[PDB]
């Protein structure tokens, strides 16, 4: 391939009637930089026109649309697929070259494009057109399944996925996607050994993707109160063994190293974690996980001013306006002023899309409690804010009452609101103390403004 | 059928699952395994 690169830039500058020279240029460029492939196709489109005004074969045009698919040029990628299908139609008699099959994969690409338009209606149309004419194909059979997976798991999503194994049980991609469905059901955690054992046949092995999935379903077992019972210690070392195995078979996997750093961070080695995550950090920043795991270390050194910025940097993806666990992992030991009131604003943003959470309404009660005790104790503060303080702690007591009546918690019962209730009662006493001080500061500001009134009369 | 081998031959895969996990740079694991052994030196 490097010698191919050398010969290709031995001939690209040349022209011994170069025709396909750009075709086999870009034919290796698809692994490499895509823009080089674009440029090769660009003059390759021209070069088929001067010797004779010959229409570009649709395999070229489909592939350049395929390039623009991973680029921002989605619309003219669609135009490329349209004119590709037309040129295949212009290959009226070419069942030797099988323009029909080329149209099949072209339509597959165009349906994948309609998915990028989020035109899932026409994506459904193209997919069912292909499957009604070539039902032996699997990728269309499961992208349809993936589309309904975006709607949900127990749809015909899961059933297209299972029948994709029924048409092809040898198919590792679909078979992986079977257990990918089961990632939604984490209560089907220990059951995933079987549904990720089926193609641990060694024809499929080695499957890095699946064995990292084993490591991941093995790590979600952690953060339980049974580590002291050596159970999660064994789980940590078993995940470590998986990670050593994927380490030896691949040094350059990055999700592996994320897994090693995660399990050792669960082992309490957080100074020993930011380094290993730093490696995958330069390797590629575009892994959503490592953004979180680094800031967990930062807040473990209480480095909030290094952490929350990178949290909202993780929020710079076009995925979800209020991801819940990220603002949870944001509001952890947040103790300064913006770490209190803007913390409340973040909790309100989360609560706006997630008013169902008991933990979130507990945590807003907690942060309201913190800001209430921040304004009534050594304060000696404004009238209006301590007037808001009594209302906000009253609200906090409403949530203390409300959550305590609820049974289910985050597997830790929140009768801890009761000591908050004794607190807020003594906070009522303190507020009745300090509101008198508020009236005192009001009357003294009245007397000093009288004192300036008299002297300005004197002037 | 003939369509299956007819399509899977003529297309190409430049983007698979497995090399997503593998990093596009060169991040070896000796440094990783060295600190793996180093934490074992604390053990």
């Amino acid at each position: 391939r490097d010698i191919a690169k050398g010969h290709l830039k031995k001939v690209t500058e040349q022209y011994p009637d170069d025709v396909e020279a750009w075709i086999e240029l870009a034919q290796i460029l698809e692994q490499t930089d895509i823009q080089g492939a674009l440029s090769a196709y660009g003059t390759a489109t021209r070069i088929l026109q001067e010797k004779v005004q010959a229409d570009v074969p649709p395999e070229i045009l489909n592939n350049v649309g395929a390039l623009h698919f991973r680029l921002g040029n989605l619309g003219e990628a669609k135009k490329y697929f349209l004119a590709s299908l037309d040129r295949a139609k212009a290959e009226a008699e070419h069942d030797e070259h099988y323009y029909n099959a080329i149209s099949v994969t072209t339509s597959y690409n165009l349906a994948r494009l309609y998915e990028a338009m989020c035109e899932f209606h026409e994506a459904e149309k193209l997919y069912k057109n292909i499957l009604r004419e070539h039902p032996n194909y699997v990728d269309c059979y499961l992208r349809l399944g993936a589309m309904a997976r975006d709607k949900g798991n127990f749809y015909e999503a899961s059933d297209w996925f299972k029948e994709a194994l029924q048409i092809n049980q040898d198919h590792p991609d679909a078979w992986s996607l079977i257990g990918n469905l089961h990632l939604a059901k984490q209560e089907w955690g220990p059951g995933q050994k079987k549904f990720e054992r089926i193609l641990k046949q060694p024809s499929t092995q080695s499957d890095t993707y699946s064995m990292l999935a084993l490591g991941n379903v093995w790590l979600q077992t952690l953060h339980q109160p049974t580590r002291d019972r050596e159970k999660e210690k064994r789980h940590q070392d078993r995940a470590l063994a998986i990670y050593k195995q994927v380490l030896r078979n691949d040094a350059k996997n990055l999700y592996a190293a994320n897994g090693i750093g995660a399990v050792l961070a669960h082992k309490g080695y957080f100074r020993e974690a930011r380094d290993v995550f730093a490696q995958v950090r330069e390797a590629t920043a575009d892994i959503s996980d490592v953004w979180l795991n680094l800031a967990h270390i930062y807040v473990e050194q209480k480095q909030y001013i290094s952490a929350v910025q990178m949290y909202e940097n993780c929020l710079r993806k076009f995925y979800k306006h209020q991801n819940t666990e990220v603002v949870l992992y944001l509001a952890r030991a947040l103790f300064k002023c913006g770490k209190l009131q803007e913390c409340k604003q973040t909790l309100l943003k989360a609560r706006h899309v997630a008013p169902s959470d008991t933990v979130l309404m507990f945590n807003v009660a907690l942060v309201l409690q913190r800001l209430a005790t921040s304004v009534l104790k050594d304060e000696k503060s404004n009238l209006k804010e301590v007037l808001n303080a009594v209302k906000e702690l009253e609200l906090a007591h409403r949530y203390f009452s409300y959550l305590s009546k609820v049974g289910d918690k985050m597997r830790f019962d929140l009768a801890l609101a009761a000591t908050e209730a004794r607190q807020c009662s003594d906070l009522l006493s303190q507020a009745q103390y300090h509101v008198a001080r508020a009236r005192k500061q009001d009357e003294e500001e009245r007397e000093l403004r009288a004192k300036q009134e008299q002297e300005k009369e004197l002037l | 059928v003939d369509v299956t081998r007819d399509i899977v031959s003529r297309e190409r895969v430049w983007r698979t699952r497995t090399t997503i996990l593998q990093s596009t740079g060169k991040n070896f694991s000796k440094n990783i395994f060295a600190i793996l052994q180093s934490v074992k030196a604390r053990e």
Binding site: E59, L212, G215, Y255, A262, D289, L328 | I20
Partner: peptide, 25 residues
């Protein structure tokens, strides 16, 4: 205050799905 905010802190790890690059004839 007396204790920090509660969380089920986990160093989770996500997986990319299958890419399905548009094909190259």
């Amino acid at each position: 205050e007396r204790s920090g905010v509660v969380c089920r802190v986990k160093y989770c790890n996500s997986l990319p799905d299958i890419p399905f690059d548009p094909k190259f004839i």
